Design a protein around this ligand. Sequence first.
Ligand SMILES: Cc1ccc(-n2nc(C(C)(C)C)cc2NC(=O)Nc2ccc(OCCN3CCOCC3)c3ccccc23)cc1
Length: 259
Amino acid sequence: DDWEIPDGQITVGQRIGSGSFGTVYKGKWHGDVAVKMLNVTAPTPQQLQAFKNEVGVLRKTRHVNILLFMGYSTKPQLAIVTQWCEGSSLYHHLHASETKFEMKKLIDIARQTARGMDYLHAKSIIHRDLKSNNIFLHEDNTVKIGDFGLATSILWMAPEVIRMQDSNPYSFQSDVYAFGIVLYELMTGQLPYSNINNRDQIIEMVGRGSLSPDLSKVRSNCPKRMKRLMAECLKKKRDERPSFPRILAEIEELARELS
Ligand SMILES: Cc1ccc(-n2nc(C(C)(C)C)cc2NC(=O)Nc2ccc(OCCN3CCOCC3)c3ccccc23)cc1
């Protein structure tokens, strides 16, 4: 198929965010859209990568819970087009807002995210950055996964990742682990290592093995099966971690019960 969008078809609204590299504007192409472009007059060889690659990956995703890739463009300046969604990042709702979700919502958020994550993995895609920021809540309703990071974090890094190891640290497994924190986030409602201020502490302490999320923090309501599953992904050793098919399957089963 062909996803290249003819030059000058798109129309760029107000800046929605900026990464140096990358900036996203609210656009208009056959309806609302979001576009990320490198305003740098001429594309560097670096950039020409972040473009090539990111379209490489997005092309291969059609799913309700993956943010919708629409098309790309080169000439005026390199650009990537996606659907425009109203809502705020999960990180936002959780840590950035008074917002209280019924456990049902919380559970479902998790269900949807796992549906999303299972899809990628099946398609042999490693997110490499999962986290509550990169989980988007559309219409405040449904979950859209993507990489909103404009700079390319620590709390979600699995240990073998924090330790440089064999430099091929990222795997479906690390992803399972990042997923595990997201659950920690959903069930407790707090980020991990809360009472720990120096951010340098966590980096050594977590990778050495001395530290993992203090689960007493998960609130009272969280189903046992859930807290288990959490603890499961957070299992320090890569092969200790469940695979997303196991996870979704679990998670669908928890919900049928709370129904
Ligand atoms: C280098 C690189 C390589 C791969 C990726 N890639 N990988 C993924 C996976 C893991 C989900 C497959 C996703 C990412 N890419 C992204 O998540 N990309 C983007 C996210 C958010 C954006 O707009 C966000 C703001 N939002 C848009 C909707 O309306 C509300 C505001 C985007 C706007 C325009 C273009 C890309 C966007 C990314 C970068």
